[PDB]
Design a protein around this ligand. Sequence first.
Ligand SMILES: Nc1nc2c(ncn2[C@@H]2O[C@H](CO)[C@@H](O)[C@H]2O)c(=O)[nH]1
Length: 903
Amino acid sequence: MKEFYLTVEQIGDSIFERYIDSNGRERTREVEYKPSLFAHCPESQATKYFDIYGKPCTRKLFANMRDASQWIKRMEDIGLEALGMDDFKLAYLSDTYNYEIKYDHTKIRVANFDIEVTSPDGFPEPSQAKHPIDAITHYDSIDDRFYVFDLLNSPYGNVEEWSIEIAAKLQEQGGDEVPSEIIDKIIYMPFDNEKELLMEYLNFWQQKTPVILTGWNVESFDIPYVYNRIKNIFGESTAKRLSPHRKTRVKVIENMYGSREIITLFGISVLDYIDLYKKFSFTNQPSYSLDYISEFELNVGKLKYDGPISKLRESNHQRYISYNIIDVYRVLQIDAKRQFINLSLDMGYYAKIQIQSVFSPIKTWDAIIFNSLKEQNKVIPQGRSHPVQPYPGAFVKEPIPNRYKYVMSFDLTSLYPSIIRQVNISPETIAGTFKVAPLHDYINAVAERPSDVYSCSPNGMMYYKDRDGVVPTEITKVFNQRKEHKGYMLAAQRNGEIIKEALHNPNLSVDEPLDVDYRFDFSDEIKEKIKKLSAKSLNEMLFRAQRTEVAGMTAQINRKLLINSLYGALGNVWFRYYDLRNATAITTFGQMALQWIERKVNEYLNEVCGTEGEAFVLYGDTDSIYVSADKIIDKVGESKFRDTNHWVDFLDKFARERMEPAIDRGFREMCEYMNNKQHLMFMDREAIAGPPLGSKGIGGFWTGKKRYALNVWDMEGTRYAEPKLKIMGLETQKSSTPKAVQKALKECIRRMLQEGEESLQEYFKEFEKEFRQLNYISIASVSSANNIAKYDVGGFPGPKCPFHIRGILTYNRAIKGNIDAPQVVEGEKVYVLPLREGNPFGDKCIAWPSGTEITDLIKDDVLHWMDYTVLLEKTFIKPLEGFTSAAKLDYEKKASLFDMFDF
Ligand SMILES: Nc1nc2c(ncn2[C@@H]2O[C@H](CO)[C@@H](O)[C@H]2O)c(=O)[nH]1
């Protein structure tokens, strides 16, 4: 069993690391690393070791690790360049784990927990943790259990224990609806006081010390709290014990907050699931409240409770404690389906880097290359910060606002990376520079062709078309691995169908499982010996395949990420290999290909249609384009098409046979113009959208850059049952808009695109009427009280103050008299509502903590007072209003000359 690390940390001149040994055991060792470095040597020498420039260098041994540090410091002082890997941890690894990796994972203590503290005012301050923690669920991958610590006594409330069984009941049985398959897997243990509680957890912890720490807002919240709190009632010395190496660092961060600390646990890789999500999600989202994502991801939703989230323990310790768990579980379920954590291992294991350093492309990439060069005997430069220069980003066409019946998209796969390789961009690949003409001309080819020996970029760059550039080759390497691992998972998946049915009537005596490398489809030789096998003898056969297809595919994705998070690191100042000219080269080229191909399209097209000065390319954005099929369709007339679906196939064959061809062909021309290394410019149709045929719906409309919506039918081949709406930046999303409204708007658009104005017009009257009977909450407007509520407490408000904070102060001036039942607003997420003027409150609008109902004393009044008309305008009419205008429509029909007359 070939070993591997877990956590590596550097303190003093010695490393400290947790790893599994040649026979599955998690141990530690404190190794005093003897770092190796380099410096350019006088040319005439004999050596391996030469930088990525030609220049030769010579090894430097430090024995003591911090000598190096003293050395480098020095060199730079003198003015001499110091080469090698400054981050020792990544260096260490490189040597010790020199081979390909192969990690177990079932062997890695991934702890997922979540604490709960009950605070008067719904939010507490992790900063000092004035209050006690009254709940803690702590899952253990290694154990498959959930450890639950409950505090029964508290100045905020002394409660009864919790019922395993009641939790085990259905809603109607006052049950917590808790999932069976978990139930037996709990280990509840209640306490009398906080000390005993923690103290134990501490011990619990010091015993089952995590490698990976997860949660939801675990980093920002849970983790700090703990730490602080402990130190508070126990003191630091003992708080420190939370780290295996019992060492630790506190870090403050800033912004629209101020103190936001993130404790850095020495020797445990912390991966807040939240971040970890946002990165690999590949799905932009509007809010990340746990229960929102669990909805989308598992449909389920969240444990519905009553009263504030601060009341709950007092008002119902039962559910308070159940939910706590559910949370942890929800996450579990997600990792298990999306598999993120697993991925990370793999990834961080691939690049041989500290696991959490997955959140940093710099870190990763750097390490990837470093290791690449290592077994190549070259030497990485020395990083050296440059300043922050505003090179442009990608292009985004200003679109004409209007309705657009038939339309179709196209995507340059990856793009940036492809560019890099299309132009052999890398730092040592930089050959020259040319007199640079205004880009505009270049895209029209009215510029003169620069260099005939060099690969060139529109910002005046020139690159050696010979030498195979570091960056470019390095990426290709990755790209092959994906092309390769993608196939792998296919073979063993499709090699699973093989064992799938030859196990429906398996049995032939009792067999011995076969030595198969599933990675490739079988062979008929092998295929015959399979039918000669039984369900017993097979099955481990079918587990490995379906699982090597699991496994293998994980990596295929891994690359997908890397490949995608590359430009992140290059466009980054701190990235060792960063260079502005390089960076700019990219974005500019990219910026070009877009309008280049955009022009080309139009040409070709209004030519093939034989129309004139007709701009078809309706909009483009970073790496996609939009073409108005409108006139193409009309050429052949709407009449012929007998099925909305009928034409859909049409555009498709067109794209694929007329279009596509012209593109590649037209991109070749560009590559040509640049004397580029190769052709890597692949853009393929990707979406088709429009009104159902016969339907007076408009198919789609735009409002401005990134402000658009449309009726999709085929999503890259995959045709659609009924349509599926693609909204973009239209506040259907923006958290702020009330739910009831969103669900509404979302609908108007559907009507528009699919049905026609009549349909819309009537619906308008609908929700309009029903507006006044809707439950207030579905109509309230959310927005964060980004705690600058402070800045306005001039007793009362004071101009240059927004609606939000206005509503909050006016609120608190009503909550003067608590009864304690009324929560107060602690710097986060609130409600907001109009109020007709001359209300007995002062100000016009109130807001209250999100998720909550309102203290009854004021409650009934508020709403009686509530401003309906206003609310509506601001919330619904206004945004809607926009749409219409852009798409050129009307929500209320023009006051006919013909009214008064009943027909
Ligand atoms: N080839 C190479 N080795 C390096 C570099 N930086 C540090 N080393 C270390 O020097 C030793 C010999 O390669 C190994 O321990 C490397 O991990 C670098 O930039 N290139």
